[PDB]
Design an enzyme around this catalytic site. Structure first.
Site, mmCIF file in Angstrom:
data_model
loop_
_atom_site.group_PDB
_atom_site.id
_atom_site.type_symbol
_atom_site.label_atom_id
_atom_site.label_comp_id
_atom_site.label_asym_id
_atom_site.label_seq_id
_atom_site.Cartn_x
_atom_site.Cartn_y
_atom_site.Cartn_z
ATOM 1 N N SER A 1 0.799 -1.218 0.000
ATOM 2 C CA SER A 1 0.000 0.000 0.000
ATOM 3 C C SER A 1 0.838 1.278 0.000
ATOM 4 O O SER A 1 0.261 2.365 -0.116
ATOM 5 C CB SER A 1 -0.975 -0.026 1.192
ATOM 6 N N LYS B 1 0.021 3.494 -2.924
ATOM 7 C CA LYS B 1 -1.106 4.433 -2.923
ATOM 8 C C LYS B 1 -0.629 5.884 -3.093
ATOM 9 O O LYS B 1 -1.338 6.695 -3.685
ATOM 10 C CB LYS B 1 -1.943 4.314 -1.645
ATOM 11 N N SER C 1 -5.922 2.986 4.360
ATOM 12 C CA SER C 1 -5.366 2.034 3.402
ATOM 13 C C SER C 1 -6.460 1.201 2.733
ATOM 14 O O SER C 1 -6.317 -0.008 2.540
ATOM 15 C CB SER C 1 -4.334 1.135 4.078
ATOM 16 N N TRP D 1 1.608 -3.498 3.834
ATOM 17 C CA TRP D 1 1.810 -4.867 4.296
ATOM 18 C C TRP D 1 1.326 -5.790 3.187
ATOM 19 O O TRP D 1 0.123 -5.879 2.923
ATOM 20 C CB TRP D 1 1.065 -5.125 5.608
ATOM 21 N N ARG E 1 4.923 -1.897 13.080
ATOM 22 C CA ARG E 1 5.687 -1.019 12.158
ATOM 23 C C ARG E 1 5.798 0.377 12.789
ATOM 24 O O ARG E 1 6.897 0.925 12.835
ATOM 25 C CB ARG E 1 4.985 -1.032 10.795
#
Ligand SMILES: *C(=O)[C@H]([C@@H](C)O)[C@@]1(C)CC(S[C@@H]2CN[C@H](C(=O)N(C)C)C2)=C(C(=O)O)N1
Length: 246
Positions: free
Chosen positions: A52, A55, A99, A192, A232
């Site tokens: 992602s 994006k 996301s 991810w 993360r």
């Protein structure tokens, strides 16, 4: 007199990743200087699927080529989505924060395979290869990019230096704000890739310090299904504090 173990930030960030029993790297760029931290520095120059994080580039391409605008409300047309939080009408920017894959799949299909491949090649993002599947090329390949390439890309975005109009880059930056306090801003985008092996996790973005200085980052690590997604963010924030970036 006993010995003393002296922990510098290099050792500390290496051990942060060890503590999670996985391999990771943190790439930092400021003043056109790149530094590598973590327990797996060879990751910095290894290609991974962007997941992602793409994006950011999808939004830039879609806005620049006038396939959407920052006020468009993308409608939830009724399929069961991966998360209940995604089952609502929302803007590009809200979909960035969540996301929300189906919003960006709709955008990718508006752009179309031909224009998407042309623009990705024009930017030179990663290996610049998107294949024939317009709705998942950033999730399961063939598009791949290194963490160094991602820090270079996101630092250019932060400085309005990508080959896009200034207004489009400013608008996409505004979609990426994650946190503000004490004169600091943190911008970024998680990723991810869960459907490849090994899984890959990302957090790519930048810090704007109170005097305006930009410190860009790209965290990249091997994920496992048992991990909380927030791992993360946890590793990023602890490392940025150790480095005195925040
Ligand atoms: C994008 O990288 C990835 C794939 C499926 O496109 C995606 C959407 C999975 C995850 S983890 C999970 C999805 N959204 C959750 C969330 O944080 N919110 C706000 C609902 C976590 C991510 C990701 O890195 O967040 N992206």
């Amino acid at each position: 007199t006993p010995s003393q173990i002296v922990q510098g930030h290099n050792q500390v960030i290496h051990q942060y990743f060890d503590e999670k029993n996985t391999s990771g790297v943190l790439v930092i760029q400021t003043d056109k200087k790149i530094n590598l931290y973590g327990n797996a520095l060879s990751r910095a120059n290894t290609e991974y699927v962007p997941a992602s994080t793409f994006k950011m580039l999808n939004a830039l391409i879609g806005l620049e080529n006038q396939k959407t605008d920052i006020n468009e409300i993308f409608k939830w047309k009724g399929e069961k989505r991966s998360f209940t939080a995604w089952e609502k009408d929302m803007t590009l920017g809200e979909a960035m924060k969540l996301s929300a894959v189906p919003v960006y799949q709709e955008l990718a299909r508006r752009i179309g395979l031909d224009l998407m491949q042309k623009e990705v090649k024009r930017i030179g993002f990663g290996n610049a290869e998107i294949g024939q599947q317009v709705d998942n090329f950033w999730l399961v390949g063939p598009l791949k990019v290194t963490p160094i390439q991602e820090v270079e890309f996101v630092s250019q975005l932060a400085h309005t230096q990508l080959p896009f109009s200034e207004k489009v880059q400013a608008n996409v930056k505004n979609m990426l704000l994650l946190e503000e306090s004490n004169g600091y801003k943190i911008f970024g985008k998680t990723g991810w890739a869960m459907d490849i092996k090994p899984q890959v996790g990302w957090l790519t973005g930048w810090v704007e310090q109170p005097d305006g200085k930009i410190v860009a980052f790209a965290l990249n690590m091997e994920m496992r299904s048992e991990m909380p997604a927030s791992i993360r963010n946890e590793l990023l924030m602890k490392s940025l504090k150790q480095l005195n970036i925040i």
